[PDB]
Amino acid sequence: GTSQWLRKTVDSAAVILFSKTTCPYCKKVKDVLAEAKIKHATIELDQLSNGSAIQKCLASFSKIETVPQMFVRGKFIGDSQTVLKYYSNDELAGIVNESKYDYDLIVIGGGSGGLAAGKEAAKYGAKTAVLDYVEPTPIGTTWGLGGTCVNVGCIPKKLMHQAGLLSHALEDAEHFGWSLDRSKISHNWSTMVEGVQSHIGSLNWGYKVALRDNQVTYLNAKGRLISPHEVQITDKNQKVSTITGNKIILATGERPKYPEIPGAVEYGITSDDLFSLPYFPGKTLVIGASYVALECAGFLASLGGDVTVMVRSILLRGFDQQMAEKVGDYMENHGVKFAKLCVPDEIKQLKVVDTENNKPGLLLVKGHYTDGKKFEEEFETVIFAVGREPQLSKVLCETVGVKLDKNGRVVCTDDEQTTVSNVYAIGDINAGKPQLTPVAIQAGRYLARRLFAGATELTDYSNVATTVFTPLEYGACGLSEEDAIEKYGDKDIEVYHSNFKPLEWTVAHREDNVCYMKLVCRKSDNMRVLGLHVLGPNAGEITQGYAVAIKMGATKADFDRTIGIHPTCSETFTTLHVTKKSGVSPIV
Amino acid sequence: GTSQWLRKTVDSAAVILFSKTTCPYCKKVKDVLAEAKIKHATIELDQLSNGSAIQKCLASFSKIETVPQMFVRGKFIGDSQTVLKYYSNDELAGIVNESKYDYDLIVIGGGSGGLAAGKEAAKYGAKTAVLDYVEPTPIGTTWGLGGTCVNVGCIPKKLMHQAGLLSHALEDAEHFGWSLDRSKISHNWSTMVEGVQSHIGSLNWGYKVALRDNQVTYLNAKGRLISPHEVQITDKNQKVSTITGNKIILATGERPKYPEIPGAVEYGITSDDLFSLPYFPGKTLVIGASYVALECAGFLASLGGDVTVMVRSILLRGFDQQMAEKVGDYMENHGVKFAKLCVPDEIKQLKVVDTENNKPGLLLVKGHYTDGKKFEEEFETVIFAVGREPQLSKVLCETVGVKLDKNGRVVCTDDEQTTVSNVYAIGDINAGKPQLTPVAIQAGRYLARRLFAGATELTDYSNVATTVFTPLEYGACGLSEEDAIEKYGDKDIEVYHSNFKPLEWTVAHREDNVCYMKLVCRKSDNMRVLGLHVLGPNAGEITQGYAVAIKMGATKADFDRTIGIHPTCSETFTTLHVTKKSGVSPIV
Ligand SMILES: Cc1cc2nc3c(=O)[nH]c(=O)nc-3n(C[C@H](O)[C@H](O)[C@H](O)COP(=O)(O)OP(=O)(O)OC[C@H]3O[C@@H](n4cnc5c(N)ncnc54)[C@H](O)[C@@H]3O)c2cc1C
Ligand SMILES: Cc1cc2nc3c(=O)[nH]c(=O)nc-3n(C[C@H](O)[C@H](O)[C@H](O)COP(=O)(O)OP(=O)(O)OC[C@H]3O[C@@H](n4cnc5c(N)ncnc54)[C@H](O)[C@@H]3O)c2cc1C
Ligand SMILES: Cc1[nH]c2ccccc2c1CC(=O)O
Ligand SMILES: Cc1[nH]c2ccccc2c1CC(=O)O
Ligand SMILES: [Ca+2]
Ligand SMILES: [Ca+2]
Ligand SMILES: [K+]
Ligand SMILES: [K+]
């Protein structure tokens, strides 16, 4: 392993120093480099099992076995004396900046994955460019640097969720002794959006500052990979240019799908538009049943909206369906209407949006139920949440040789490498991976370290925890119950479960036996926890810590031996005893 | 091990059936017992490593090696045919109810530990009595069944904390778009207390119902252990009686201390009084700096109170002092005044409490600072939070032979056994153990199973997670930083840390770089996580899950390999990189 690893590390690193903790000549070079403002990776051989072996294999590259040894872009540059020679002669800058390419790394896409990869790479001396361009939505919405999560995803979604939760805090406050006349309390959509957008703006700016502070070149331009190392960029002016890079990271993300029905693109909106919408949506129809559909419907209802969700078949396809049903039942019991087994046929315009007084328009939605009954209802706003899709040109990807799948996503090795060996793909366009911001960030940071600092650690995409920020939140880590039973068989699966009631809900007169948790375990494997599921407040805070234990192979016994923190919702995971096979009720 | 275990199991179990999954005669007996409403423990020998060996050792008790075998109170009763003989002859009830003692278990104390132990024991056929009596506070406050947490502890404390958090939710709601005139919003203490007390009342009742439903005898009487198996009880009428029990569980808990200064008992109150106080405390002085002191001060301030904490030396003695300082700094920045390095000398009455209009009285507190300056200030309410102490008579404990320590707590083996071998102690009076409700519950349930169902599992009291429900909450699991450095030395400890900002605080215009987390790790032991600490909202939900991983031996690498859930506070634990030794700032 050592020699193959060393060959790839030396070939790929932009500027790398092989060193030892204890080496005065190593510190000499480190200080000259720091003095010269030259960033680099460092591998301390004395902190590695195989450091001994590595130091000797280096002679296959350097002809020496001493430390320090500095390499630039695959070329041995020198020991301590040679580096100081270059420094003294003011040749060092030109050496560390010599390359066949304009950049060591070009990142195409300035979102969760691409910004994380670009910043991490720059730390090790990789001369880096990040390209980002936001193609406007059909009604012309655009936004700044940061990608989907920052601008039209997790960040504004969770902030609007919080605004919705505050509706229930206002209700609860009365029961806890606060004197407030809710009859006189209303919500102002545009005040909320202005606050959300001011925060997003601070993030757009912050990322630009972060890139500048790491000496990353930020180009607000559309990038097109036209050969393995050439990226064609088109700026706002439509000026076309070409830049070259050693490594390329595709991090271009996805955009919302529209259904192919008359009126959808003209009169509907998607999540891309919702989070900066200048007018309150008013009476709203959400078409779709993904976590985005339900999250959006949920906070619109809590903000006082008349909300309907049109569901083609099931809720939260791909998630544990028992939990999905409970999520939806809570929503229906708390205002959200569901038109189940229903699809849209056409959207007709009845009023145009009032761009002046910031009022919504009015739409007639025609569709049909599976039972043959017609759906025909007026809505002020119609939101499509029917899937997201990558935006890579299949043709041009074919030309360069980057393989895509059926769905247009990039087919990658377990180290994110595409079929073009210097080109990598991270984030939502990486076929088969969980489409989540912390996944993209971990992938991009870990990839940058393997490319430019000799790291070996891969991203682990197994048992990645999630949380759906519906009005009652749903956290999960690992297998759904049904997937566990399909994999291992019903006889090998035990499911421990319980209802519970947040203490906060008692004085507030909220529901018994609605919050719910379960552990799906494998009997044959010492009751290994295969999946954890919780429906309740703060479900993401609950779930996160357990994801560490699950990654370590937690068993039911590990949960049982841990002592609860009281009073919390999470502590119920430490005292589960009712199994599904026992038939005993999980109510409490 | 097998024979010693079997000897103790047979001796101690009230009614126990040795059985196998696959045994029709075993099911015959199980059904006769279920039919006869006879509860019992069951040990399925075919589900045990040493089942083979156990089945043969049973002959040392039964003279047979077959299953089923039923025992009552140390006596082999019969195989299947003998049990049905007794049943058919209507002798079985009298056999299973024959004992030298009135009860298999008497629990002295109806709180967190004692109720948990009593209910669990009853499940296995132990005829159980639970004694509970609430000695009134100096001003006459009393309450119902359930103990300190239910009545005057975790439950009302966290509910009043929630009422306080709702103050900040009301503030935040404006920034998230809600239209409310806070100038017109006030808090009504007595409305809050009525809601809290209605919930506590439902718990008092619920426990009484639970005891009835498990056939546990509940005596609202003061119990006194006068010999190993004899408990003298005094009812409300002052009628004295004596009942006998095989096993005794002492679960009597603690009560607040008062300082030995004039006026303290007459005019101050403690947490015992606060949670049902009929009048709003008004301008309040909390004397003490325990987690109870700070929790109480914190919610009183958030409910609009003018609050001062008088601190003799340090905050949260015994907790990580960096975190304690941050907890206190947050409180001071949010209204709570601190009279630091100050102790009280006397409490003088200026107004008596208005028991009619439910208004507080008025007190003059005289004390002095370490710098010699005198403290003299008027308060409407003075709350002592200076420690809690057990209430066991040292003399009578000596007589029976139950050893106490310096502090009056019971000295126990790691299986909760006192120096009187049939007498056990759980909960806050168990010397050296964490004084927490889930600890007491786990101890009592696990003890009941060892006594009456042949279990071997001990309670693990190591790395028990905690949360301090101050206005900004503080969760912890494992060693403080200072204790880790004392144990292993500064060179062997690495501390990863970061500030963070809840997304919820951004639009709400709350603080950057106040929430904080750290992992204290042992370098020599693969960066084992020795202590986890988090200051932030929902800190108990954050911490709980990680307690499972820490119990399993989590390392920093285990945290790093786990993927965050976004957006959450907890996910920051999965991306910590700044160490204290690096000197780099933890701000973000
Ligand atoms: C409503 C919604 C809510 C979500 N909520 C959560 C949540 O709560 N938690 C969570 O973990 N995940 C959430 N996600 C998922 C999260 O947004 C994605 O997983 C994450 O943004 C993907 O990051 P990425 O780097 O793959 O791509 P993106 O963040 O989409 O960034 C890609 C960037 O590249 C731009 N681009 C595209 N093509 C080019 C090109 N040729 N040249 C230059 N630039 C280009 C794109 O316009 C964009 O700016 C949510 C997503 C949505 C839509
Ligand atoms: C303000 C405060 C807040 C707290 N907050 C938390 C928290 O948030 N989380 C947490 O885990 N812990 C908390 N605790 C700790 C928790 O209350 C205790 O750890 C728990 O109640 C101890 O349970 P126990 O069974 O040992 O005793 P207790 O719950 O005190 O029960 C003992 C019972 O026995 C009665 N009794 C005493 N003597 C006799 C006798 N001779 N005969 C009959 N009955 C008798 C007592 O009156 C009482 O009813 C808090 C405690 C306090 C004071
Ligand atoms: C959005 C989406 N992805 C799918 C994958 C398989 C089968 C159906 C669907 C639907 C629609 C639906 O849930 O009916
Ligand atoms: C309540 C309490 N327990 C202690 C243990 C050791 C030293 C001091 C104290 C104090 C008072 C204080 O913190 O000054
Ligand atoms: Ca437990
Ligand atoms: Ca991570
Ligand atoms: K659909
Ligand atoms: K004190």
The tokens of B273 are what? 């009084």
Chain breaks in chain A (C to N over 2.5 A) after: none
Q: At what angle do helices B189-213 and B112-123 cross, to 10 degrees?
A: 20
Contact assignment for A558 to B544 by CB distance below 8 Å: no
Contacts of A117 (CB under 8 A, 6+ apart): A105, A107, A249, A251, A426, A443, A444, A445, A447, A448
Per DSSP, what are the bridge partners of residue B223? B233
Check if B551 contacts A (Cβ < 8 Å). Answer: yes
Give, as one character, the DSSP assignment of residue A409. P
Q: Which two tokens stand for residue A191?
A: 């005040």
> Where does ligand 1 bind, in terms of residues with CB under 6 Å?
A 108-114, 131-134, 147-149, 153-154, 157-158, 222-223, 251-253, 271, 292, 391, 427-428, 435-438, 440; B 566
Tokens of B282: 């008004």
Residue window 92-151, chain A: list those with CB within 8 Å of chain B: 149
Angle at the Cα of A519 from the Cα atoms of A515 and A524, rounded to 5 degrees: 165
CA angle A130-A131-A137, nearest 5°? 140
The residue among A442, A566, A571, A573 with the most chain B CBs within 10 A of its CB, best to mutate, is A566
Cβ-contact B338, B314 below 8 angstroms = no
Amino acid at A56: K
Catalytically annotated residues of B: 566
Q: Which residues contact A167 (CB under 8 A, 6 or more apart)?
A: A187, A302, A303, A304, B178
Euclidean distance between the first and final Cα of chain A, in Å?
56
Find chain B residues with C-beta within 8 A of A176's C-beta.
Answer: 159, 162-163, 166, 192, 195
Put simply, whether B358 touches A (Cβ < 8 Å) is no
Beta bridge partners of A354: A359
What phi and psi, each to the nearest 5 degrees, are found at residue B494? Answer: -115, 140
Residue A292 in contact with ligand 3 by CB distance below 6 A: no
Q: Is A577 on the interface with B (CB under 8 A)?
A: no
Nearest CA owner, ligand 2 atom 53:
B153
Alpha helices for A372-462 (secondary structure H): 394-400, 437-452
Q: Which atom of ligand 1 is nearest to the CA of A275?
A: 1
Instruction: Answer yes or no: are the C-beta atoms of A273 and A292 closer than 8 Å.
Output: no
Nearest residue on chain A to B160, judged by CA atoms?
A176
The answer to whether A462 contacts chain B (CB < 8 Å) is: no
Are the Cβ atoms of B544 and A186 closer than 8 angstroms?
no
Written as one letter, the residue type at B497 is: H
Q: Judge if the beta carbon of residue B443 lies within 6 A of ligand 2.
A: no
With beta carbons under 8 A apart, name residues in chain A contacting B547.
545, 562-563, 565
Asked if B118 contacts B216 with a C-beta cutoff of 8 angstroms, the reply is yes
The residue whose CB lies within 8 Å of the most ligand 4 atoms, and thus the one to mutate among B270, B313, B314, B317, is B317
Question: If 0-12 CB within 10 Å is exposed, 13-18 middle and 19+ buried, where does residue A212 land?
Answer: exposed
**Which of A173, A198, A559 is nearest residue B548 as measured by Cβ atoms?**
A559
Tell me if residue A580 falls in helix, strand or coil: coil
Closest Cα to residue B92, out of B77, B111, B75, B112? B77
Residue A570 to residue B541, Cβ atoms within 8 A = yes
CB-based contact A120:A111 (threshold 8 Å): no
| Residue A204 CA, ligand 1 centroid: distance in Å | 14
Residue among B68, B324, B468 at smallest CA distance from A567: B468
Number of the ligand 3 atom closest to the C-alpha atom of A386: 1
Nearest to A453 by CA among A2, A7, A17, A137: A17
- CA B299 vs. chain centroid, Å, equals 21
Using CB atoms, which residue from A178, A191, A507 is nearest to B159? A507
Residues in chain B within 8 Å Cβ distance of A195: 175-177, 507
> How is B16-28 classified by DSSP, letter by letter?
EEEE-TT-HHHHH
- Quickly list DSSP for B289-354: -SHHHHHHHHHHHHTT--EEEEESS-SSTTS-HHHHHHHHHHHHHTT-EEEESEEEEEEEEEE--B
**A516 contacts A586 by C-beta, under 8 angstroms:** yes
- Both structure tokens of B364: 């003059």
Please, where are the H alpha helices in A474-570? 481-488, 504-507, 539-551, 556-561
Report CA dihedral (B311, B316, B322, B325) to the nearest 10 degrees. -40
For the Cβ of A317 lying below 6 angstroms from any atom of ligand 3, the answer is yes
Q: Using CA atoms, how far apart are residues B313 and B305, in angstroms rounded to an integer?
A: 24
B132 lines ligand 2 (CB under 6 A): yes
If you measure from the C-alpha of residue A324 to the centroid of ligand 3, how many angstroms do you get, rounded to a whole number?
14
In a mutagenesis test of the A interface, which of B186, B456, B548 is the best target, namely the one with the most A β-carbons within 10 Å? B548
CA-CA distance, A446 to A423, in Å (whole number)? 15
Give me the residue from A195, A540, A558 closest to B551, CB to CB. Answer: A558
| 3-class DSSP assignment, residue A390 | strand
Residue that the structure tokens 């552990």 belong to: A519
| Residue listed under structure tokens 């056990």 | B424
Query: Does residue A312's CB lie within 6 angstroms of at least one atom of ligand 3?
Result: yes
Nearest to A523 by CA among A476, A572, A586, A579: A579
Ligand 2: which residue has its CA nearest to atom 34? B109
Structure tokens at A275: 């989070």
Identify the closest residue of chain B to A440 by CA–CA distance: B563
Q: How far A477 CA sits from the closest chain B CA (Å)?
A: 10
List chain B domain ranges. 1-100, 101-256+387-462, 257-386, 463-588
Using DSSP bridges, classify how beta strands A240-250 and A230-234 pair: parallel, antiparallel or unpaired.
Answer: antiparallel
Instruction: Find the angle CA(B228)-CA(B230)-CA(B232) to the nearest 5 degrees.
Output: 130
How far is A515 from A474, CA to CA, in rounded Å?
10
| Beta bridge mates, B389 | B255
CB B300 within 8 A of CB B284: yes
Residue B13 neighbours by CB distance under 10 Å: 24
Would you call B158 an interface residue with chain A, using a CB distance cutoff of 8 Å? yes
The contacts of residue B331 (CB under 8 Å, 6+ apart) are B294, B297, B298, B301, B309, B338, B470, B471, B472
A489 Cβ contact partners less than 8 Å away, ≥ 6 residues apart? none
Query: Distances in Å between the alpha carbon of A105 and those of A250, A411, B533?
Result: 11, 20, 38
Strand A254-256 and strand A374-379: the pairing is unpaired
Closest listed residue to residue B419, CA positions, set B397, B396, B402, B404:
B402
Q: To probe the interface with A, which of B167, B198, B544 has the most A CB atoms within 10 Å?
A: B544
CA distance between the termini of chain B: 56
- Please state, as a whole number, how many other Cβ atoms lie within 10 Å of the Cβ of residue B102: 17
Q: Is the CB of A341 under 6 A from ligand 3?
A: no
| Secondary-structure breakdown of chain B: helix, strand, coil percentages, each rounded to the nearest 5 | 35, 25, 40
Query: How many angstroms separate the alpha carbon of residue B269 from the centre of ligand 3?
Result: 63
Q: Are B301 and B331 within 8 A, CB to CB? A: yes
Residues of B numbered 290-319 whose beta carbons fall under 8 angstroms of chain A's beta carbons: which are they? 303
Q: Which residues contact B333 (CB under 8 A, 6 or more apart)?
A: none
Atom 12 in ligand 1: which residue has the minimum CA distance?
A: A436
Helix (H, G, I), strand (E, B) or coil at A181: coil
**Over A90-106, what HEC string results?**
CCHHHHHCCCCCCEEEE
Is the bond into B567 cis (omega within 30 degrees of 0)? yes
Q: Are B247 and B12 in contact (CB under 8 A)?
A: yes
Measured CA to CA, the distance from residue B161 to residue A176 in angstroms comes to: 10
Please identify among residues 413-442 of chain A the ones whose CB lies closer than 8 Å to any CB of chain B.
436-439, 441-442
Instruction: Indicate yes or no: CB of B558 within 8 angstroms of CB of A570.
Output: no
Q: Name the minimum distance, in Å, from the CA of A442 to any CA of chain B.
A: 7
* Interface contact B544-A545, CB threshold 8 A: yes
Is residue A97 within 8 Å of A130, Cβ to Cβ? no
B chain contacts of residue A551, beta-carbon cutoff 8 Å: 558, 561-562
Q: In A290-359, where does DSSP find H-type helix?
A: 291-302, 321-333
Residues of B in contact with A433 (CB under 8 A): none
Is the CB–ligand 3 distance for residue A386 below 6 Å?
Answer: yes
CA distances from A157 to A275, A467, B149, B390 (A): 7, 12, 38, 51
Each residue of A425-434: b (16+ CB within 10 Å) or e? bbbbbbbebb
Phi and psi torsions of A245, nearest 5°: -145, 150
Among residues A292, A271, A268, the alpha carbon closest in space to that of A143 is found at A271
Q: Which ligand has the nearest atom to the CA of B575? A: 6
